[PDB]
Design a binder for this molecule. Structure first.
Ligand SMILES: CC(C)C[C@H](N)C(=O)O
Ligand SMILES: [Ca+2]
Ligand SMILES: [Ca+2]
Ligand SMILES: [Ca+2]
Length: 335
């Protein structure tokens, strides 16, 4: 009379309205009659953004015959190894936040994300920036697999747009040396900086330091920056609450009425994940969760609050889901 979806997320450490978006979707699914006549419930586990806790949660979900699918995890360094446990168990893992390209590069069959990867975000950013007249840019990046990853993706797409990367760097010691870098960048004709560092991983510090030194050029970053020195910052992300679409607007109004504040991109990704999984589960054999992955692929294009979703053979979401967001007066405007 009851079925369960597992959710693994750093619930306690983040004020990101993710739980609210999940809860709104579950309420909607139950109001419409549940899944195969059964009430839908969530089993929430907090991975504290820690790999060891994440792997333990993954095994606990995988060993529980009552879990039909899992939504999670948030951080790619947890989702990638946790996905091995879910994949070997034949249990769907659907991530609403992990953007590393590597997630879908391990031959897994049960592993999905319902948001664009870093590579798709980079591709759309390069297109936009070139149309805006960028020609010579600098990349500030984290010298790890994820930082090198997004940096190399952006450089490759920017090059195809006729943008030259005139310098890339991963460290500066103090503001004086950032001044010296900015002098070199001016001599190279710099017109913008792409920050391939996460906001919590040194990104925000650079933003503040850049303003101190007087760096004038546009700053561009990826999805961790969705979560007022930032005036004019361009962010490649997902979810447009101003999208003039019935589904997006029904969600925005419902979310506002229930929770008394605007939904975040994570509330939206969580909501679409629950709705997507419930639709696939309606049509599936609930006694065999290893059949659900094919059912998700069988949906083909599927309309959600984020836009149109579609899973490919590797589990990437190839829908046109990227939304470019620009900071104006402490608020994102939507391009
Ligand atoms: C929401 C982000 C901070 C998570 C990040 N996109 C990752 O893949 O790790
Ligand atoms: Ca199983
Ligand atoms: Ca050129
Ligand atoms: Ca350099």
């Amino acid at each position: 009379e009851e079925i369960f979806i597992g959710v693994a997320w750093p619930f306690a450490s983040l004020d990101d309205l993710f739980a609210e978006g999940l809860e709104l979707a579950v309420q909607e699914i139950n109001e419409q009659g549940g899944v195969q006549g059964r009430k839908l419930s969530l089993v929430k586990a907090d991975d504290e953004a820690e790999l060891e806790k994440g792997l333990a949660i993954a095994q606990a979900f995988a060993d529980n015959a009552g879990i039909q699918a899992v939504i999670g995890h948030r951080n790619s360094f947890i989702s990638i190894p946790a996905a091995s446990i879910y994949d070997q168990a034949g249990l769907v893992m659907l991530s609403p936040a992990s953007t590393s390209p590597d997630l879908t590069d391990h031959g897994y069959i049960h592993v999905f994300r319902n948001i664009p990867s870093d590579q798709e975000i980079a591709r759309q950013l390069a297109i936009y920036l070139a149309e805006q007249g960028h020609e010579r840019m600098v990349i500030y990046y984290t010298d790890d697999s994820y930082g090198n990853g997004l940096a190399n993706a952006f450089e490759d797409y920017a090059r195809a747009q006729g943008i030259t990367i005139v310098d890339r760097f991963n460290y500066y010691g103090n503001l004086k040396d950032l001044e010296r870098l900015y002098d070199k960048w001016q001599a190279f004709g710099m017109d913008g900086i792409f920050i391939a560092k996460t906001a919590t991983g040194g990104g925000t510090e650079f933003l503040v330091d850049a303003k101190s030194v007087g760096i004038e050029v546009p700053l561009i970053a990826g999805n961790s920056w969705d979560a007022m020195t930032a005036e004019g910052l361009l962010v490649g992300s997902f979810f447009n609450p101003q999208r003039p679409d019935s589904r997006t607007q029904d969600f925005v109004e419902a979310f506002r009425r229930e929770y008394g504040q605007p939904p975040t991109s994570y509330a939206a990704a969580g909501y679409d994940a629950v709705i997507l999984l419930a639709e696939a589960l309606e049509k599936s054999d609930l006694t065999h969760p290893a059949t659900l992955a094919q059912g998700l692929r069988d949906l083909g294009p599927w309309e959600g609050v984020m836009g149109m979703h579609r899973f490919d053979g590797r589990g990437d979401d190839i829908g046109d889901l990227v939304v470019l967001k620009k900071m104006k007066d402490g608020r994102f405007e939507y391009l």
